Design a binder for this molecule. Sequence first.
Ligand SMILES: CC(C)(C)c1ccc(C(=O)Nc2cn3cc(-c4cn[nH]c4)ccc3n2)cn1
Length: 331
Amino acid sequence: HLICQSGDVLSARYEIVDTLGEGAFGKVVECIDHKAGGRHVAVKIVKNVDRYCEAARSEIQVLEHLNTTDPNSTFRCVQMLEWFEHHGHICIVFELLGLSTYDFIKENGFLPFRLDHIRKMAYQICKSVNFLHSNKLTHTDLKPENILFVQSDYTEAYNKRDERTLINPDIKVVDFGSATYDDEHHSTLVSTRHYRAPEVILALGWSQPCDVWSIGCILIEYYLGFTVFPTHDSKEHLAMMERILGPLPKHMIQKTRKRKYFHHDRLDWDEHSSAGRYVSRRCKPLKEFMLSQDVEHERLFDLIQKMLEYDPAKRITLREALKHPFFDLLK
Ligand SMILES: CC(C)(C)c1ccc(C(=O)Nc2cn3cc(-c4cn[nH]c4)ccc3n2)cn1
């Protein structure tokens, strides 16, 4: 807040007019670009933390590569316009987007998206991340907060109360600070808890399939308006998985160094604990979360179940996901 107040012309070009987001990462601000004719842009002001300078370095590198391969943004990665240093911070300039998909559900009284909208968003997410995968990249940090609408405009109509309906459901993918190349160093802990794959938690090594898991979790949240993994603990997360998807594969449990979670190669979960009772009443088999048994609902959950396959070697690829009957209605 000391160096990012309104009116500030960062690096003698970018007039700050609003702050859009704040956190440990730093801040995202809306700016007028005077040398681009007042066109509004988003500027990520990176915190002076070592971890976030490294992520910033890597996001610049990844997007310079991606925006160069896909300059028209056919595969819906956010465009990076430029980067610089100002007041000792790294600043990354992006095309301005709208509300995140998370923010939208939130601001809509936690109402889920309509299925026709989920199909379009799911297709665009899969296309985007499949493009990354074809370029030897894993995003690792896919979540509703990192899926942003191009335009946040909505119409309002009484339904309970007023419903908000997107004028344009199109999305782009953001935050490439954790994106990792196949041949480069893999961090052990990746993703925000609610969205990390079992192979990540169990430290079994990860690659592109861990993105597929995250998307599976995102689609559930679009369909329900809430997460099915409401936890802040690894072992509890695993227990939630077991209740929703069934027990972990034995071969995965035998291979993990995470012995602390297990006892005799079974999850060491105490069902007489407070956590135990909480998991039992909040979680249930995946198919029980369905709101309808109509064909297209069955198709979404068939796809979701494939995406949430425990074994990453067996998990559906995004290339295969794009061929799923759920997307047929897009033709
Ligand atoms: C409701 C209204 C006032 C109209 C509103 C709300 C939110 C936003 C917004 O949040 N916009 C926004 C955030 N962005 C983040 C990135 C990025 C993060 N990491 N990497 C890249 C890139 C572009 C980008 N645009 C814009 N308007």
